[PDB]
Structure formats: structure tokens, C-alpha cells
Amino acid sequence: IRGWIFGTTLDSKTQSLLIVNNATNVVIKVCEFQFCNDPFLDHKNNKSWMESEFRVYSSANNCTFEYVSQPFLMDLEGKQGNFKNLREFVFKNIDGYFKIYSKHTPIIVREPEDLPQGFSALEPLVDLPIGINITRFQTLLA
């Protein structure tokens, strides 16, 4: 799981938001993205994944906001089970500001899913002045 897309219609007629952590840097682009109907970065060789299909937006038209920051710490390679990593994010859009808060806790093991009983507060990560309204969000993956 790498990024997210936010919008209200997502058909190159309303302003759209994209966030990607897959690249070497964290990239946030508020643009008039024309997402094609196949938002996948995973279909690759028989057991490996690459950074292919990096143009899932078929058109990047007249648009405004761009931002690059340092990457966030993920793990390496692919494993089955032993998911030590656990990631939490909260996204809000209030008073014309897009607020993203983040938290990452490693070293969790249990046989069932659906989170433990943990008391973990969330630190503020970024506040952005995107200045749009959003109605539907779709997760991205690689």
C-alpha cells in the first residue's frame, strides 16, 4: 500500500489530489488528473513487483499544486506473515486546509486481524493549503 487519491468526480472535470510514497520521495500533487479505470501498480512479473505504470493518470492538465518531501520509512522486500509494521493515518479537510496526521508502530504479532487494544495518540504530520472540496477517496497499491 503506497498512496491515495482524493476527489469528488475523478473524471478530469474536477480538481483532484494524489499522494504517493512509492517513489524515492514523498510526492503530493493537487492536479486535474484523469485517472484511468485501472488504478494498479502491482501487476508485474510472476513473483516480483516493479515501479511500472507510473502514468496511471492519462492526462495531467492545467492545474496548480505540487509538493515534494522526504520519504517515510517502510520495510524491505515482501514477506508472508510476521507483520511487525502497523501504520495509522487520519485525513481531515477543515477550514480550507487538508490535514494529514500519521503514526507508525512496529513489532506487533498476533494471529487475528482487526487491530489490538492500544492507546496510541497521533502526532501531526502535515497541513496543506489545497483549497478544494473532496467527496470520494480511493486507495492505491503497488
Partner: protein, 49 residues
């Protein structure tokens, strides 16, 4: 400009309020009267700018 400065635009067809501090680019032709227009520059189908 005495010769005509049309570069400044404004919106007057939304039928919706706004929260503080956002911009909206609605290039699509607004429809009023609850009848599907599906056309361009028609009656009761006005350009929003």
C-alpha cells in the same frame, strides 16, 4: 484597458454555498429547471463564467 480587458472572470451560477478559503473550477454548463439539458448554449443552460 480602454480597448477591452476580458481576462478577469467571475462565477454567478452555482446554486451552492461555500466554506471559507477554497477555489472551484466548474467549467461545465450549469443546468436549471430540473430538465436534462445535455447540450451547449441552450435555453436555461447558461455558461457559468
Amino acid at each position: 484597458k480602454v480597448s477591452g480587458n476580458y481576462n478577469y472572470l467571475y462565477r454567478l451560477f452555482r446554486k451552492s454555498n461555500l466554506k471559507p478559503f477554497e477555489r472551484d473550477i466548474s467549467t461545465e454548463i450549469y443546468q436549471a429547471g430540473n430538465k436534462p439539458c445535455n447540450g451547449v448554449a441552450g435555453f436555461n443552460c447558461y455558461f457559468p463564467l
